[PDB]
Amino acid sequence: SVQIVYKPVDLSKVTSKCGSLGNIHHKPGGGQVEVKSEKLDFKDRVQSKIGSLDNITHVPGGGNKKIETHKLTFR
Amino acid sequence: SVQIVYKPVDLSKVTSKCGSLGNIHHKPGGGQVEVKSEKLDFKDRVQSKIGSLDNITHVPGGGNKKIETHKLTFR
Amino acid sequence: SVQIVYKPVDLSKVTSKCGSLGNIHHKPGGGQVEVKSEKLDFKDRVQSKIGSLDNITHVPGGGNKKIETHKLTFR
Amino acid sequence: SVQIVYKPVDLSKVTSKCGSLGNIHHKPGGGQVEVKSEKLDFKDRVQSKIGSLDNITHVPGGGNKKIETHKLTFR
Amino acid sequence: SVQIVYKPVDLSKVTSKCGSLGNIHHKPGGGQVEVKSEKLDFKDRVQSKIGSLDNITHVPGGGNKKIETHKLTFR
Amino acid sequence: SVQIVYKPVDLSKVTSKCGSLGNIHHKPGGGQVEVKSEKLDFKDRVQSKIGSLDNITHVPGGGNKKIETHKLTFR
C-alpha cells in the first residue's frame, strides 16, 4: 500500500514602495518615414508595416509579479 | 490500496504603495509617414498597415499580478 | 546755352516656353509641433507663432520678370 | 555751350525652352518639434517661432529675369 | 564748348534649352527637434526660432538672368 | 573744345543645352537635434535658431547669368 503527503507553506510579502513616481516620457517614431517602390513583382504572400507600431509604455506603479506552480503525478 | 494527501497553504501579501504617480507621456508616430508605389504586381495575398498602430499605454496604478497552478494526476 | 538729348531704344523678347508643367507638391509642417511652458515671467512685449506659417507655393507658368529704370537730373 | 547725346539700343532675346517640367517635391519640417520651458524670466522684448515657416517653393516655368538701368546727371 | 556721344548696342541671346526637367526632391528637417530650457534669466531682447524655416526650392525651368547698367555723369 | 565718342557693340550667345535634367535630391537635417539648457543668465541680446533653416535647392534648368556695366564720367 501507498502513503503520500504534501504540505507546501508560504507567508512571503513581495512589496514595492515608492514616494513619488514622476515624469516618464516616450517618443517613438519622432522622425519621418518614407517608402517609394516601383516595378515590384511578387508571386507569394506579402505583409507590410510602415510607421509607428506596437509601442508599449507599461508603467506599473506596482508591477509586483509573483508566480507559483505545483505538479504531483502518480503511475 | 492507495492513500494520497494534498495540503497547499498560502498567506502572501503582494503589495505596491505609491504616494503619487504623475505625468506620464507617450507620443508614438509624431512624425510623417509617406508611401508611394507604382507598377506593383502581386499574385498572392497582401496585408498592409501604414501609420500609428497597436500603441499601448498601460499604466496600472497597481499592476500586481499574482498567479498559481496545481495539477494532480493518477493512473 | 544747353542742348541735351535722350534716345533709349529696345525690342527685347523675354520668353519662356514649356510643353507641360506638371506635378508639383509641397508639404511644410508635415510633423507635429508641441510647446509646453510653465512659470514664465515677461516684463516686455511678446510675439509668438506656432505651427505652419508664411508658406508660399508660387508657380508662375510664366514668371518672366522684366524691369527698367531711367533717371535724368539737371542742376 | 553744351551738346550731349544718348543712344542706347538693344534687341536681346532671353529665352528658356523646356519640353516637360515634372515632378518637383518639397517636404520641410517632416519631423517633430518639441519645446519645453520652465522658470524663464525676461525683462525685454521676446519674439518666438516654432514649426514650419517661410517655406517657399518657387517654380517659374519661365523665371527669365531681365534688368536694366540708366542714370544721366548734369551739374 | 562740349560735344559728347553715347552709342551702346546689343543683340545677345541668353538661352537655355532642356528636353525634360524631372524629379527634384527636397526634405529639410526630416528629423526631430527638441529644446528644453529651465531657469533662464534674460535682461535684454530675445529672438528664437525652432523647426523648419526659410527653406527655398527655386526651380526656374528658365532662370536666365540678364543684367545691365549705364551711368553718365557731367560736372 | 571737347569731342568724345562711345561705341560698345555685342552679339554674344550664352547658351546651355540639356537633353534631360533628372533626379536631384537633397536631405538637410535628416537627423535629430536636441538642446537642453539650465541656469543660463544673459544680460544682453540673444538670437537663437534650432532645426532646419535657410536650405536652398536652386535648380535653374537654365541659370545662364549674364552681366554688363558702363560708366562714363566727365569733370
Following DSSP, what letter does each residue of F19-70 receive, concatenated? EEE--B---TT-S-EEE--EEEEESS-EE--EEEES------S----B---B
| Subunit partners of chain D (3 or more CB pairs within 8 A) | A, B, C, E, F
- Test A31 with E27 for CB contact under 8 angstroms: no
Instruction: Give the residue from B64, C74, C54, D45 showing the smallest Cα distance to E72.
Output: C74
- Test D26 with C31 for CB contact under 8 angstroms: no
**How far is C-alpha D54 from the geometric centre of its chain's CA atoms?**
12
Interface test with B, best of C23, C32, C33, C36 (most B CBs within 10 A): C32
Is E49 within 8 Å of F49 (Cβ atoms)? yes
Interface test with E, best of A23, A32, A38 (most E CBs within 10 A): A32
Pairing outcome for strands E50-53 and F50-53: parallel
Give A26 to chain E, closest Cα distance, Å: 13
Q: Determination method here?
A: cryo-EM
CA distances for A54 relative to B46, B48, D62, E32, angstroms:
20, 15, 49, 20
Instruction: Give the residue from A2, A69, A5 showing the smallest Cα distance to B75.
Output: A2
Q: Using an 8 Å CB-CB cutoff, list chain A residues near D26.
A: none
Distance from C-alpha of A60 to C-alpha of A58, rounded to nearest angstrom: 6
Is E63 within 8 Å of D16 (Cβ atoms)? yes
Q: What is the torsional sign of CA A54, A60, A66, A69?
A: negative
Distance from C-alpha of C27 to C-alpha of A59, rounded to nearest angstrom: 36
CA distances for E16 relative to C10, D18, F61, F62, angstroms:
22, 8, 7, 5
Q: What is the DSSP code (8-state) at residue D29?
A: T
Three-state secondary structure of chain B? CEEECCCCCCCCCCCCEEEEECCECCCCCCCCEEECCEEEEECCCEECCEEEECCCCCCCCCCCCECCCECCCCC
Q: Using an 8 Å CB-CB cutoff, list chain A residues near D31.
A: 30-32
Other C-beta atoms lying within 10 Å of the C-beta of residue D41? 15
The amino acid at D41? D
Distance from C-alpha of C12 to C-alpha of E64, rounded to nearest angstrom: 14
Q: Using an 8 Å CB-CB cutoff, list chain A residues near D32.
A: 27, 30-31
CA distances for B8 relative to A2, A11, A75, B15, angstroms:
20, 12, 21, 22
Distance from C-alpha of E39 to C-alpha of E53, rounded to nearest angstrom: 27
Interior/surface letters D47-66, b for 16+ CB within 10 angstroms, e for the rest: ebbbbbbbbbbbbbbbbbbb
